[PDB]
Design a protein around this ligand. Structure first.
Ligand SMILES: CN(C)c1cc(-c2ccncc2)c(Cl)nn1
Length: 276
């Protein structure tokens, strides 16, 4: 598929950076014709067929295809796509309240009500994606953004569909692998992946939300991955002594090695800690 090749600077003015990654830079922008603001994600393209730098056209097209399909309050929306010889430029909905990651660092850890307030929205967003047979594969606090960080109950949106894939056959067997602290054992072991990987990630996020601590984090990436594969985590009393047994139950049913035995998104929404 080809995208709009007009100079993006002809239709938009850019401003402050809102994110810098390995192969992408995100800048706030304003459309000249409407005055509306967006986030422009500039993704560097591969310069040669077998280059290691940049994102393959195949990967960019998949991301765009998934983004064009989604419309839900808890997921980011794609406005337009531009491209030139060096980059693909995604004009995305602006989410200006910062990362759930930064908010978490500002509070240390959340109460169960605050954690379930965020978690319910994450679950709703993932329920939408899974309903569409879309696995995100990169769920973590950095990829959760608040619309407004200064309200008592912030609204959140899931971002960064860079690793997302359609799962038409129940599983996918490809070069997929995100951040060690949040990836499921099946990712670590290079096994077929499905929607269940996202449910493990949610378990990790939930543990972090309640404690301020990462459950499998080691001193090196390889140690983290090893901990994940062995399901080497525990609820430290120092952090969980006043956490409800039901909250721990929820986490325990997500941090299960066998994907077939892990709670599904539907089960998570019916779990007693979540179900109102
Ligand atoms: C923080 N990281 C990794 C981000 C943030 C954004 C973003 C920022 C603001 N509004 C919408 C999206 C995107 Cl597109 N990609 N990565």
């Amino acid at each position: 598929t080809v995208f709009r090749q007009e100079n993006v600077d002809d239709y938009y003015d850019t401003g402050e950076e809102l994110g810098s990654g390995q192969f992408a830079v995100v800048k706030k922008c304003r459309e000249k014709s409407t005055g509306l603001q967006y986030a422009a994600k500039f993704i560097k393209k591969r310069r040669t067929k077998s280059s290691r730098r940049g994102v393959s056209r195949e990967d960019i097209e998949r991301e765009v295809s998934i983004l064009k399909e989604i419309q839900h309050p808890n997921v980011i929306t794609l406005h337009e796509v531009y491209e030139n010889k060096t980059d693909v430029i995604l004009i995305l909905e602006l989410v200006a309240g910062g990362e759930l990651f930064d908010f978490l660092a500002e509070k240390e850890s959340l109460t169960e009500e605050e954690a379930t307030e965020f978690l319910k929205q994450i679950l709703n967003g993932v329920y939408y994606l899974h309903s569409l047979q879309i696995a995100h594969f990169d769920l973590k606090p950095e990829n959760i953004m608040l619309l407004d960080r200064n309200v008592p109950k912030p609204r959140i949106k899931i971002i960064d569909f860079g690793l997302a894939h359609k799962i038409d056959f129940g599983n996918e067997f490809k070069n997929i692998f995100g951040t060690p602290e949040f990836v499921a054992p099946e990712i670590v072991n290079y096994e077929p992946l499905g929607l269940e990987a996202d449910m493990w990630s949610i378990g990790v996020i939930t543990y972090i939300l309640l404690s301020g601590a990462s459950p499998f984090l080691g001193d090196t990436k390889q140690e983290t991955l090893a901990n994940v594969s062995a399901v080497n985590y525990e609820f430290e009393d120092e952090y969980f002594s006043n956490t409800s047994a039901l909250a721990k139950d929820f986490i325990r049913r997500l941090l299960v090695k066998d994907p077939k035995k892990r709670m599904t998104i539907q089960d998570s929404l019916q779990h007693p800690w979540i179900k109102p």
